[PDB]
Amino acid sequence: KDRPSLCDLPADSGSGTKAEKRIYYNSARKQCLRFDYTGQGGNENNFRRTYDCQRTCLYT
Template sequence: MKSCTLALVVLVTLSVIQLTVARRPVCLLPPVAGYGNLAKTRFYWDTAASRCRSFTYNGKGGNDNRFVTKADCKASCEK
Protein backbone atom coordinates (compact mmCIF):
# COMPACT_ATOMS: atom_id res chain seq x y z
CA MET A 1 0.00 0.00 0.00
CA LYS A 2 2.83 2.39 0.85
CA SER A 3 4.49 1.77 -2.50
CA CYS A 4 1.24 2.57 -4.34
CA THR A 5 0.88 5.81 -2.41
CA LEU A 6 4.49 6.74 -3.10
CA ALA A 7 4.09 5.96 -6.80
CA LEU A 8 0.96 8.14 -6.95
CA VAL A 9 2.74 11.04 -5.24
CA VAL A 10 5.67 10.77 -7.66
CA LEU A 11 3.33 10.64 -10.66
CA VAL A 12 1.38 13.70 -9.56
CA THR A 13 4.59 15.61 -8.82
CA LEU A 14 6.04 14.82 -12.23
CA SER A 15 2.79 15.87 -13.92
CA VAL A 16 2.82 19.23 -12.16
CA ILE A 17 6.47 19.78 -13.07
CA GLN A 18 5.80 18.93 -16.70
CA LEU A 19 2.88 21.36 -16.91
CA THR A 20 4.92 24.13 -15.31
CA VAL A 21 7.93 23.64 -17.58
CA ALA A 22 5.79 23.42 -20.72
CA ARG A 23 4.41 26.93 -20.25
CA ARG A 24 6.31 29.98 -21.40
CA PRO A 25 8.44 31.41 -18.56
CA VAL A 26 6.57 34.72 -18.81
CA CYS A 27 3.38 32.94 -17.76
CA LEU A 28 4.99 31.98 -14.45
CA LEU A 29 5.57 35.59 -13.39
CA PRO A 30 3.25 37.20 -10.82
CA PRO A 31 1.00 40.07 -11.93
CA VAL A 32 2.58 43.49 -11.35
CA ALA A 33 0.38 46.60 -11.52
CA GLY A 34 3.33 48.91 -12.22
CA TYR A 35 3.06 52.64 -11.72
CA GLY A 36 1.46 55.60 -13.47
CA ASN A 37 -2.08 56.83 -14.00
CA LEU A 38 -3.31 54.68 -16.89
CA ALA A 39 -5.50 52.25 -14.85
CA LYS A 40 -6.30 49.86 -17.71
CA THR A 41 -7.66 46.34 -17.38
CA ARG A 42 -5.11 43.77 -18.48
CA PHE A 43 -4.90 39.99 -18.12
CA TYR A 44 -2.28 37.73 -16.56
CA TRP A 45 -1.86 33.97 -16.31
CA ASP A 46 -2.64 32.74 -12.78
CA THR A 47 -0.48 29.63 -12.42
CA ALA A 48 -2.25 28.41 -9.28
CA ALA A 49 -5.69 28.57 -10.92
CA SER A 50 -4.47 27.60 -14.42
CA ARG A 51 -6.44 30.41 -16.03
CA CYS A 52 -6.23 34.03 -17.12
CA ARG A 53 -7.41 36.68 -14.68
CA SER A 54 -7.86 40.41 -15.00
CA PHE A 55 -5.94 43.05 -13.05
CA THR A 56 -5.47 46.81 -13.20
CA TYR A 57 -2.27 47.88 -14.93
CA ASN A 58 -1.13 51.43 -14.22
CA GLY A 59 0.70 52.02 -17.49
CA LYS A 60 4.42 51.79 -16.71
CA GLY A 61 6.72 49.10 -15.35
CA GLY A 62 5.41 45.68 -14.51
CA ASN A 63 6.50 42.52 -16.29
CA ASP A 64 5.58 40.58 -19.42
CA ASN A 65 2.83 38.48 -17.81
CA ARG A 66 0.45 41.20 -18.99
CA PHE A 67 -1.85 40.82 -21.97
CA VAL A 68 -4.26 43.29 -23.57
CA THR A 69 -6.96 40.67 -24.08
CA LYS A 70 -7.95 37.49 -22.33
CA ALA A 71 -7.66 35.71 -25.68
CA ASP A 72 -4.00 36.80 -25.99
CA CYS A 73 -3.34 35.54 -22.46
CA LYS A 74 -4.94 32.18 -23.18
CA ALA A 75 -3.15 31.80 -26.51
CA SER A 76 0.20 32.46 -24.84
CA CYS A 77 -0.19 30.52 -21.61
CA GLU A 78 -3.06 28.02 -21.71
CA LYS A 79 -2.03 24.48 -22.57
Protein backbone atom coordinates in the same frame (compact mmCIF):
# COMPACT_ATOMS: atom_id res chain seq x y z
CA LYS B 1 6.80 22.97 -22.71
CA ASP B 2 6.13 23.48 -21.60
CA ARG B 3 4.85 26.51 -20.49
CA PRO B 4 6.29 29.79 -21.41
CA SER B 5 8.07 31.10 -18.31
CA LEU B 6 6.29 34.41 -18.74
CA CYS B 7 3.19 32.74 -17.35
CA ASP B 8 4.96 32.28 -14.07
CA LEU B 9 5.42 35.90 -13.77
CA PRO B 10 3.65 37.79 -11.31
CA ALA B 11 0.90 39.88 -11.76
CA ASP B 12 2.41 43.17 -11.38
CA SER B 13 0.33 46.25 -11.25
CA GLY B 14 2.92 48.82 -11.65
CA SER B 15 2.84 51.99 -9.79
CA GLY B 16 1.74 54.24 -12.59
CA THR B 17 -0.67 57.08 -12.76
CA LYS B 18 -3.09 55.68 -15.36
CA ALA B 19 -5.65 52.87 -15.03
CA GLU B 20 -5.70 50.15 -17.63
CA LYS B 21 -7.53 46.87 -17.75
CA ARG B 22 -5.35 43.99 -18.74
CA ILE B 23 -5.26 40.22 -18.24
CA TYR B 24 -2.62 37.83 -16.93
CA TYR B 25 -2.36 34.16 -16.40
CA ASN B 26 -2.97 33.36 -12.77
CA SER B 27 -0.64 30.57 -12.12
CA ALA B 28 -2.26 29.03 -9.04
CA ARG B 29 -5.78 29.20 -10.44
CA LYS B 30 -4.38 28.03 -13.81
CA GLN B 31 -6.78 30.64 -15.23
CA CYS B 32 -6.38 33.92 -16.88
CA LEU B 33 -7.56 36.87 -14.79
CA ARG B 34 -7.84 40.57 -15.09
CA PHE B 35 -5.59 42.94 -13.21
CA ASP B 36 -5.05 46.61 -13.25
CA TYR B 37 -1.98 47.48 -15.11
CA THR B 38 -1.27 51.07 -14.77
CA GLY B 39 0.92 51.88 -17.72
CA GLN B 40 4.08 52.78 -16.06
CA GLY B 41 6.18 50.35 -14.18
CA GLY B 42 5.03 46.95 -15.09
CA ASN B 43 5.97 43.43 -16.01
CA GLU B 44 6.14 41.53 -19.26
CA ASN B 45 3.13 39.39 -18.40
CA ASN B 46 0.68 41.68 -20.02
CA PHE B 47 -2.04 40.29 -22.13
CA ARG B 48 -4.46 42.59 -23.80
CA ARG B 49 -6.73 39.81 -24.95
CA THR B 50 -8.14 36.74 -23.22
CA TYR B 51 -7.37 34.28 -26.07
CA ASP B 52 -3.82 35.58 -26.16
CA CYS B 53 -3.33 34.56 -22.53
CA GLN B 54 -5.24 31.31 -23.14
CA ARG B 55 -3.33 30.36 -26.26
CA THR B 56 0.10 31.00 -24.85
CA CYS B 57 -0.32 29.60 -21.34
CA LEU B 58 -2.90 26.97 -21.84
CA TYR B 59 -1.59 25.26 -24.73
CA THR B 60 0.98 23.23 -23.24
